[PDB]
């Protein structure tokens, strides 16, 4: 059983746990804890085939960049989840995948590009100012609600497709 390692990457204040517990456990979790490393392993099937998804949460504290670099390299799938509700964290994608070009060590990288807190009115970026900014980057972006868990289950299938696309 293929255990793809998912790495959730994020600024502070989206809700990166409201996304990987949703689709772990089904719940969406309300209290803000700062998720500074957590694992979540659980037999999903993507494409007819059930594969071990290995998931670490890890803390988007600034304060943690060399151990950050470490595990950067050891990851395969990226997930960018950033908030729509921050425009500051848009700006800030390319910032980070700076990074992940130098980590993977590669201009090429299977990711996603999801834009979490659309379940909520307070929206800053639209849609297609993501969707620009995606082109570059080569990797499909989709509104992913928190409360509702719309998006999510499609954002995943998605991701896992396109590391398999990397790796064959
Ligand atoms: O390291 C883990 C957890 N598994 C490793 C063996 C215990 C289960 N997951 C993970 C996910 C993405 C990136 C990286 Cl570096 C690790």
């Known amino acids: 059983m293929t255990e793809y390692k998912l790495v959730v990457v ?3 204040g989206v809700g990166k746990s409201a996304l990987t517990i949703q689709l772990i ?3 969406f979790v309300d209290e803000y804890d700062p998720t500074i490393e957590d694992s979540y392993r659980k037999q999903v099937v993507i494409d ?8 670490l949460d890890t803390a988007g504290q600034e304060e943690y960049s060399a151990m950050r670099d470490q595990y950067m390299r050891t990851g395969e799938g990226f997930l960018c989840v950033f908030a ?3 425009t500051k964290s848009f700006e800030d ?6 990074q992940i070009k130098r980590v993977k060590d590669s201009e090429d990288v299977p990711m996603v590009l999801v ?17 620009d900014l995606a082109r570059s980057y080569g990797i499909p972006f989709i ?14 299938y998605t991701l896992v497709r396109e590391i398999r696309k990397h790796k064959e």
């Open 48 to 55: 007819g085939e059930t594969c071990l998804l290995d998931i």
């Open 143 to 156: 509104e992913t609600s928190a409360k509702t868990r719309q998006g999510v289950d499609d954002a995943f």
């Open 84 to 86: 729509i509700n921050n």
């Open 10 to 12: 994020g600024a502070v």
């Open 115 to 131: 834009g979490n807190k659309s379940d909520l009115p307070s929206r800053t970026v639209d849609t297609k100012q993501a969707q």
């Open 93 to 98: 994608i390319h910032h980070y995948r700076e």
């Open 25 to 27: 456990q089904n719940h």
